[PDB]
Amino acid sequence: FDGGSRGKGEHFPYEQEIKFFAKVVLPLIDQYFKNHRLYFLSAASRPLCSGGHASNKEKEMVTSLFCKLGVLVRHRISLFGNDATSIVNCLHILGQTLDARTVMKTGLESVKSALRAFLDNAAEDLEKTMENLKQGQFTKGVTQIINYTTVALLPMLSSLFEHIGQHQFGEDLILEDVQVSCYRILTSLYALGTSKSIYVERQRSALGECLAAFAGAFPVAFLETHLDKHNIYSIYNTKSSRERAALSLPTNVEDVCPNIPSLEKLMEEIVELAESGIRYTQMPHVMEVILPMLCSYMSRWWEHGPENNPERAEMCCTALNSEHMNTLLGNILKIIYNNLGIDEGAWMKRLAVFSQPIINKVKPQLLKTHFLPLMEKLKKKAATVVSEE
Numbered sequence: 265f266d267g268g269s270r271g272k273g274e275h276f277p278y279e280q281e282i283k284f285f286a287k288v289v290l291p292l293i294d295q296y297f298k299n300h301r302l303y304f305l306s307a308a309s310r311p312l313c314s315g316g317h318a319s320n321k322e323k324e325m326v327t328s329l330f331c332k333l334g335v336l337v338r339h340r341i342s343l344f345g346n347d348a349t350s351i352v353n354c355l356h357i358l359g360q361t362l363d364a365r366t367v368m369k370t371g372l373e374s375v376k377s378a379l380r381a382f383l384d385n386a387a388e389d390l391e392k393t394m395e396n397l398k399q400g401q402f403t404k405g406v407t408q409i410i411n412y413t414t415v416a417l418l419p420m421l422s423s424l425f426e427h428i429g430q431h432q433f434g435e436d437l438i439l440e441d442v443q444v445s446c447y448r449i450l451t452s453l454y455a456l457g458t459s460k461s462i463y464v465e466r467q468r469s470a471l472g473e474c475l476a477a478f479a480g481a482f483p484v485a486f487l488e489t490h491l492d493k494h495n496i497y498s499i500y501n502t503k504s505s506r507e508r509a510a511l512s513l514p515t516n517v518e519d520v521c522p523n524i525p526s527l528e529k530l531m532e533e534i535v536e537l538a539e540s541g542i543r544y545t546q547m548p549h550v551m552e553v554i555l556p557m558l559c560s561y562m563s564r565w566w567e568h569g570p571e572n573n574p575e576r577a578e579m580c581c582t583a584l585n586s587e588h589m590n591t592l593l594g595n596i597l598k599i600i601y602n603n604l605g606i607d608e609g610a611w612m613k614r615l616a617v618f619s620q621p622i623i624n625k626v627k628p629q630l631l632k633t634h635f636l637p638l639m640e641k642l643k644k645k646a647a648t649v650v651s652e653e
Contacts, residue, residue, distance in 0.1 A: 265343070290350045293329075297357045305431075307366045323363040324371045330358040331378035334420070338385060341412045352416050359424040364433035380442055386421055387445040389413060390452035397461055414467045421449075422474035429480030429564065435497055438483060443499040444511065447520060450478060450486065454524050457553035469614065472553035476618060479560040485581045487527035487561055489518045495581045530558065531592070538595040541602040544611065551603070552611055555596060556618035562589055563621040590630065593622050597638050600650055612650045623653070 265276055297304075303316040304326055333355055341348045367375065393413045396406035428434050438446055453475040456464060464471070483497050492498050500508060500517045514520050525533070537550060544551055562584055569584030570577050596619055600612050626635075642648050 286345060286347050286350075290347065290354050294350070294354045294357055297354075297361050301357070301361055304361045305363055307363050318363075320366055320370045323367050324375050326358065327362055327367045327371070327379060328375045330355065330362060331375070331382050333358065334382050335378075335385075337416060338389075339409070339412055341415050342408065348415065352419055355416075355420045356423045359420065360427050362424070362427065362433075364428060364431075364437040368436050380445075383442050383445045383449075386417060387448040387452070389417055390449055390456075394452055394455055397456070397459065397463055401463070410463070414470065418467070418470045418474045422470075422477045425474070425477040425481035429477065429482075429560075434481055434483040439497070440499065440503065441511065443484070444513065446478075446482065447486075450475075450482070451521055451523065453478060458523070458549050468548060468552050469611075472556055473614075475553060476556040476560045479557050480564045482564075485565060486521060486524065487530070488582055489520075489526065491581060491583065492517045494579045527558075527561075530554065531588075534558070535591065535595050538599040538602075541599070543606055544603045544609070548611075551599065551615060555615055558592060559596075559619050559622050562592065563625065566625055586627075586630075589622055589625060590634070593619065593626060593635075596622075597635075597641075601641055601645075604645065604648060604650070608649045610649075616650050616652065 265278070265282075268276065302312050304318045304323060306312060306317055307323065308317075333351065337344075337348070337351045337355065344351060367379075389409065390413070392409055396409060400406075428437060453471060457468065457471050457475060484495060484499075485492065492500060495501060498517070499513075503511070503513075505515075509515055534550070534555070537547070565582040566572065566584050566589070568581050570580050571584075571586060573580065596615065600615065604612065623631075623635075638652065642650070642652060
């Protein structure tokens, strides 16, 4: 259709075939993988002990179908007859049904390379979005790429990353050069989130949520680049100097991601901006993207934080602290409450949903006598949009 559609005709004889595909195959795929989500996901962890351990070949073919549908949907949102939402839903459910640990360790090379190429293509498309959205708005091709990104690429990547983070598949999925592609993805997402452009205004929320999911999917402490030597999964540690130099790498794990600040610098700028109490419209970027990123990152890295493993200390990947999350949560509430007088917004609700894991890891004995200011400030306010707990 792409080959012949530019020469003489827009309507082609396979219209019956494509109409059957769109009207039948996609909806049945979505419904089937929604009904039997747990059957494929169950592997040696015994969910639904009644039975239903899907075979490794089944998992491999599921992943291959996911990759093939991603390739099909790439850069072709307008070609589909307004069912691109249906393809996105199918890709969402397949992302929830993926089984990375089993597929990666036991899978066929074509499927492995197909997943790697899907990740690489996503990174390349995000880089293309960077380059157009920054260096030039004038060209319809770049507009089509931006539309494809916003419509499909962000939700699909967000769902896949959230699944990987919640099932801890990253440690076996992202090992070599997929590490590099996801580094490029992280740079793309942060640059888009922090971009000054008027165009990003509509997709700030989706970008922020996708980057928050990426923070929990990522198995490398990118925020704290000083204790990367203790991390065993780091591409710098595993890849060795010769191979890291052969690859397109900065050779400095501290300089591998310049634009993103460190966890510390981010943290005192958060607390300083909270003390200043600047209104939300002046810097939507922080409260809409950066804070959820911090919550997801610290929620993921707390169990690797020194307190949760007193043994092997000073070999921890991160240096997270109970008072670190306490200060983060206190700053979050303080800035919500300083911004809660001017015309409010749903972004408080989104940030509260994002910060819910933080208050869950916060000890209840910490909650009493410390966050009582939160509840009293809730109630003495005549009306508060924020739904706590």
